[PDB]
Amino acid sequence: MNAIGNFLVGTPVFTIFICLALGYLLGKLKIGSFTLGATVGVLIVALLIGQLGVFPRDTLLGDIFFDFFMFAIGYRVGPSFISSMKKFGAKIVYATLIFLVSAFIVAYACFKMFHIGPGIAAGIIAGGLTQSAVIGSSLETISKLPISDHLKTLYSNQIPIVYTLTYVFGTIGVLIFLRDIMPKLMHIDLKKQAVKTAKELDMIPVPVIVASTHFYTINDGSSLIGQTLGTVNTKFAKGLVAAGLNDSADMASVINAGDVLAISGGIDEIGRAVQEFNLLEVTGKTKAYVSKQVVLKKNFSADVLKNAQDKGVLVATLAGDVMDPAQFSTLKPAESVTLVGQKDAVSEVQSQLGRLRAAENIINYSWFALGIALSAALGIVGTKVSGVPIALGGGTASLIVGLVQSIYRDKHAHMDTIPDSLLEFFQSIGLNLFIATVGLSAAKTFISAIQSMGISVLLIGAVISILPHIITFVICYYLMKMEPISIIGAQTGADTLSAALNDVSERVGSDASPFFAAAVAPAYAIGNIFLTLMGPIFIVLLS
Amino acid sequence: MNAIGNFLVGTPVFTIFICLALGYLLGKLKIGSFTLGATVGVLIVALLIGQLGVFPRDTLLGDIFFDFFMFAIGYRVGPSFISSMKKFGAKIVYATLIFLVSAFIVAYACFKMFHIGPGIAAGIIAGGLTQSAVIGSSLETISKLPISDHLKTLYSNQIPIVYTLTYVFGTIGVLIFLRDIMPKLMHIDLKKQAVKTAKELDMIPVPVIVASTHFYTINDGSSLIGQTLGTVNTKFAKGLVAAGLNDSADMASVINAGDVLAISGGIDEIGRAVQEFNLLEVTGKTKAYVSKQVVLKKNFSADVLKNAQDKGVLVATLAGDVMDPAQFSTLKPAESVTLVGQKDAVSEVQSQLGRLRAAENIINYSWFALGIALSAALGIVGTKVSGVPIALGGGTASLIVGLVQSIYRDKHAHMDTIPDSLLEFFQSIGLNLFIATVGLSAAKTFISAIQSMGISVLLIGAVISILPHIITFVICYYLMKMEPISIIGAQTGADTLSAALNDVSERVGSDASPFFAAAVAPAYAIGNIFLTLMGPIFIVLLS
Numbered sequence A, B: 001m002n003a004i005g006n007f008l009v010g011t012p013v014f015t016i017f018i019c020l021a022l023g024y025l026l027g028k029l030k031i032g033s034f035t036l037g038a039t040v041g042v043l044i045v046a047l048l049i050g051q052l053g054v055f056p057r058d059t060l061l062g063d064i065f066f067d068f069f070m071f072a073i074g075y076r077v078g079p080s081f082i083s084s085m086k087k088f089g090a091k092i093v094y095a096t097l098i099f100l101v102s103a104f105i106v107a108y109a110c111f112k113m114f115h116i117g118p119g120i121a122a123g124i125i126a127g128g129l130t131q132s133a134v135i136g137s138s139l140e141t142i143s144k145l146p147i148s149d150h151l152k153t154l155y156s157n158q159i160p161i162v163y164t165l166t167y168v169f170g171t172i173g174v175l176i177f178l179r180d181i182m183p184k185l186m187h188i189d190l191k192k193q194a195v196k197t198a199k200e201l202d203m204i205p206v207p208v209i210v211a212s213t214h215f216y217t218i219n220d221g222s223s224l225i226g227q228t229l230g231t232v233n234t235k236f237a238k239g240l241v242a243a244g245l246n247d248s249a250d251m252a253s254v255i256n257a258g259d260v261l262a263i264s265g266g267i268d269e270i271g272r273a274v275q276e277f278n279l280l281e282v283t284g285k286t287k288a289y290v291s292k293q294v295v296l297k298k299n300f301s302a303d304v305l306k307n308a309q310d311k312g313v314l315v316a317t318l319a320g321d322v323m324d325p326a327q328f329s330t331l332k333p334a335e336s337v338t339l340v341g342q343k344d345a346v347s348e349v350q351s352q353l354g355r356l357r358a359a360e361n362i363i364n365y366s367w368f369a370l371g372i373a374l375s376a377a378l379g380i381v382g383t384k385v386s387g388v389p390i391a392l393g394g395g396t397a398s399l400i401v402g403l404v405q406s407i408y409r410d411k412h413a414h415m416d417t418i419p420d421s422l423l424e425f426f427q428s429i430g431l432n433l434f435i436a437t438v439g440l441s442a443a444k445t446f447i448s449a450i451q452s453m454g455i456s457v458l459l460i461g462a463v464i465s466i467l468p469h470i471i472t473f474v475i476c477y478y479l480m481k482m483e484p485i486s487i488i489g490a491q492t493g494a495d496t497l498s499a500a501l502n503d504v505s506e507r508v509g510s511d512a513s514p515f516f517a518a519a520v521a522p523a524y525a526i527g528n529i530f531l532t533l534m535g536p537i538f539i540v541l542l543s
């Protein structure tokens, strides 16, 4: 009975990664009509495990794995923010401002009416308004602010316990309220209304067809044998070209017998070409005919574009698509494009068109590390407001750093892009690891604190977690008469619920997912910054 | 001058992630004809940075980020190990055994001839034989073994300093020796000889063609209008089927006008079909006609396979390819396969064929965490040999756990697969972070130790890093007369050099990369286990 606790305290890695394994299973368990979720399951399992031992809490591991989560969230939100700012109106920002004001007023009123101490107030804020940087910011503010030392220790110790108590209700309750109750009240379907609104706007994604090189070989005795390749290419419709016979690129090489054309262009265009003149579609074996993407120079000469069209290299954008010849003159200078053709001829046109680009798969670890370092440096800075040393915080600055990096990489393509699955791994495991560490830390005195303050730490959290959403929903839908889905988006962005974001995104469908992302993106940054700042101000005010 | 040090010691995240950013740039700097590399650049930058402050070392962060690296390496090596054991001979294992014996003899002789103390001996082993778990295993062994307390502190403190000194020469020197000097001595080219040997064997990868659904629409008045769909499907050659008109699947629906066939099969087969009867290749817009992968049941009925061939569902393996009908009877029971067809008809055949499978992109975080926990638990176990409490170690057990998990997931496909870029991120950043932490730790007393022991800690490391490779190369090539490339593979696997592995793999070409991986894979596990065990034995013997 003691040996198991000795083993658990001896090996922290086993404890941390065994409080993270069973949590996902508990979250994926289906009980009744609600699923607990990964974070809540991890918190419950950590709370149960932590009773056995006296495990302490490591600050650096949690800080790093939370900075990774914040950077991943900022990177994912990045591209949608500027698009929502351009196209969606300011009502998205206005809803967040209303929600923040309402939460401030309700929290102040409840804390004043119940005389809640500053430590419990910080815990209730950090739990009901689901933000994790509040714990660290409040600890730093409590350390800086002048009080008795015993008061400092008590206030610093009481925060994680109240955090773990109220976090349990916040995620599940607000998820249920924003996923079922509000759609039932508005008498809409989440899929249908969002699809209709996305159809009204132009957020609906449009698929892009990419040209490819298909190796059609010649039918012998087709009566077209004996025509020069340049005239055959001019015979092809707009957007077509033949790379050349075998792996060679020669202007005047008439058809001999059964040789390959390697037609490049759009699928329907190749189809009409085949119906114009029959050809054998053969898989072929050649590694020379490969496309390449290259960033252009500032001069971005178009005469070389015409000469490459004559030469046998199809022009396409970075995504890959045939484009109008009139776009040659009015192209964007120094814009990366993709071309298909011969092994070295594409490189020749590249040398005459611009510097070589870089592949998507490779990752700039130097840029990753520099982003993390700049996030920490930005979080260092802080100002004082009437004796309150407020600071941006470590996690909050990472969101801004990721946003700026994504926006700047969208324009300037010199830097490479982080793979998609890496971001999902980052956010998921980082958030669950931070939650597991906190829950393992605050576990021994859990039962003592739930004996000391039973109902005056859960009902307050429930009220502060539910009431502002109801007020802002009523104001937005009944009085101001906004659109249906943007209300959900703005509320779930202001409350900073990534689980609710993901659940509504997966329920709504892939068609309107770039709509919901645009609805949520402007809210997240303002909500995070103001909720991070709310903590120290509340501690100072109730103190 | 003091403020910068105060900032650096105040914020460990900034220091750790700023000693990791400049390191990659320094490694990618081109000086002369050699590149320093990421790990060596990080060590140099960490050593320069650590002079300013008094930063301590965190054990948990390094342990976790090294366990991730070891798990990623084991997962990548996994599939090749059993294939190399089956096809490559036992000479691969024999070369590693010879190398380990030679390294043991040379190290014992040098340490006895120079009376090197046990701590310096552990450091020299951990540096010259590039293995990082030696530090932790030696620290644990020194803690357990009975000596005077001052001796314990001195021996524990001297290890990282000697480690950082000799690690610099090991990677660069052995990389140069195994990449240029040995090919010059054997008078071979790394690309050509490996390609020839892979052609002699059957390690050469073979590309696989996957069938797809192409929506050919009907030419009006083609004289084939008015034939039932079943007879048209039987008219199609072996390996072809038409899903059905529009998005429907009806057996008797004659061609009306300009309707789509949605031909499915191999590209060349569709080409001969189009030449048999002309069709318009149109991109089309339909989301119903999507393929699915499903794991089969044990009964794996083949009558339903024939009925699905009649029905209009093409049969393919998980990779995706047309397969012979005679393979229907002799298929593997409960083997996952992929089918193309209608939105729900594929699900019908699935219901009659087996349980639904899972997608590639999704990751089982529960399996990841359980693997890490089992790695720690396996590393806990240990035995005693004449008073030496040897143990497997934390990092070493992770390699075995990853190997077993990859091998078991290859057979049983219920568990999902980790994405590829995640493994590369894991190994790279984890190894560089551990190296940065160690270098930042052992920096203040670096100059004092290089004043105390100048030349008697570098020449010994160079000799122990160079000489065993020369001996084993001479024995393998001149006396035993082995094959050329397997010598390089076995030596680079026995020395456990991931940088050398990656560099030779990228230089050799993608064609022979699954050959070099098979040549290196058997060596790595035995080398890691024996090099991890070598440390405590050496400490006890020289003590």
Ligand SMILES: N[C@@H](CC(=O)O)C(=O)O
Residues within 6 Å of the ligand: A130, A131, A132, A431, A496, A497, A498, A499
């Ligand atoms: N999405 C939330 C998760 C949490 O609070 O733990 C946040 O980043 O604030």
Ligand SMILES: N[C@@H](CC(=O)O)C(=O)O
Residues within 6 Å of the ligand: B130, B131, B132, B431, B496, B497, B498, B499
């Ligand atoms: N590939 C080496 C790297 C190192 O020693 O740091 C190893 O895992 O042992």
